[PDB]
């Protein structure tokens, strides 16, 4: 029902504490389902899929619906990838309106290993190497980068702009957009720091397509990027790739430590 998908229906009353998941980059909460396999049996889980804007103003548009579906809390919010941002994100609101958030899990939602900067110098370097990517690919001499038309565009223009030179099936152009945007939004999100709880899953690297985008994600850091903004902060390593930690096996290991926070949480209600 809109960008909520039910995963596992809580009861009609009572019962467990709600798991709310947030979609990854490019992808949606149906990825969770392999973690849901792994959680204490009768967890309820709510997938959040996509919404349009920056964190932010994602954020503002999941809380309400948050609020409406578990009112005070407990809150347990969790999120692979771009996931990981936004249920971090919605901590934060929720907190601010003083309700009882319980438990953050980031499945390998880790920060570059230096921070991305915003600017226009690295627009037209991040547009000369997706150039110099488009001429190997597509076996096309591509000319001279119209720079200050694209500087001055938001992510949704620049892709806009992209997809009239290449003037592609429609789905094909959904699928390509909204991972691009998804993953500009994990490159420009600007964390704000949270004085509650947070398990970070930490893979042990950044999968080899996602590095030649982004060089800066080649390199991370022991906290993920997250210590300086969480005091608070647990780091689970569970090795492998980021596109692996979703899945069987490593979500395993995951969904076992998970379930004994969950078994606590329960515990701290009765
Ligand atoms: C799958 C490879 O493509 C990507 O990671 C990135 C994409 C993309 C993916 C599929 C289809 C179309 C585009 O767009 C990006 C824009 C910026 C950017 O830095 C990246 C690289 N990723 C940013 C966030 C990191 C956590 C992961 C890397 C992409």
């Not at 096309?140 to 892709?159: N, S």
């Not at 949270?194 to 042990?204: E, K, Q, R, S």
């Not at 906290?223 to 979500?251: F, R, T």
Request: aromatic share 10%.
């Amino acid at each position: 029902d809109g960008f909520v998908r039910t995963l596992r229906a809580r009861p009609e009353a009572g019962g467990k504490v709600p798991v709310f998941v947030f979609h990854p980059a490019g992808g949606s909460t149906v990825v969770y389902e392999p973690l849901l396999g792994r959680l204490p049996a009768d967890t309820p889980m709510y997938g959040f899929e996509r919404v349009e804007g920056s964190i932010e103003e994602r954020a503002q548009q999941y809380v309400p619906k948050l609020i409406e579906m578990q009112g005070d809390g407990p809150y347990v919010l969790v999120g692979w990838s771009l996931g990981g941002v936004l249920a971090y994100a919605c901590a934060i609101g929720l907190r601010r309106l003083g309700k009882d958030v319980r438990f953050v899990g980031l499945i390998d939602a880790v920060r570059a290993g230096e921070e991305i900067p915003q600017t226009k110098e690295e627009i037209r370097k991040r547009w000369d190497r997706y150039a110099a990517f488009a001429e190997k690919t597509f076996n096309v001499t591509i000319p001279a980068i119209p720079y200050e038309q694209l500087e001055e565009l938001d992510d949704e223009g620049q892709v806009r702009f992209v997809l009239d030179a290449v003037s592609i099936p429609a789905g094909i152009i959904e699928h390509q957009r909204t991972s691009y945007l998804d993953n500009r939004a994990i490159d420009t999100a600007q964390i704000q720091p949270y004085d509650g709880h947070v398990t970070l899953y930490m893979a042990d690297r950044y999968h080899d397509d996602a590095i030649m985008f982004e060089p800066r994600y080649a390199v991370r850091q022991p906290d993920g990027g997250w210590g300086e903004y969480v005091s608070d902060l647990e780091v689970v390593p569970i090795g492998g790739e980021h596109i692996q930690a979703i899945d069987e096996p490593i979500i395993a290991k995951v969904g076992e430590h998970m379930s004994r926070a969950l078994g606590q949480i329960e515990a701290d209600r009765t």
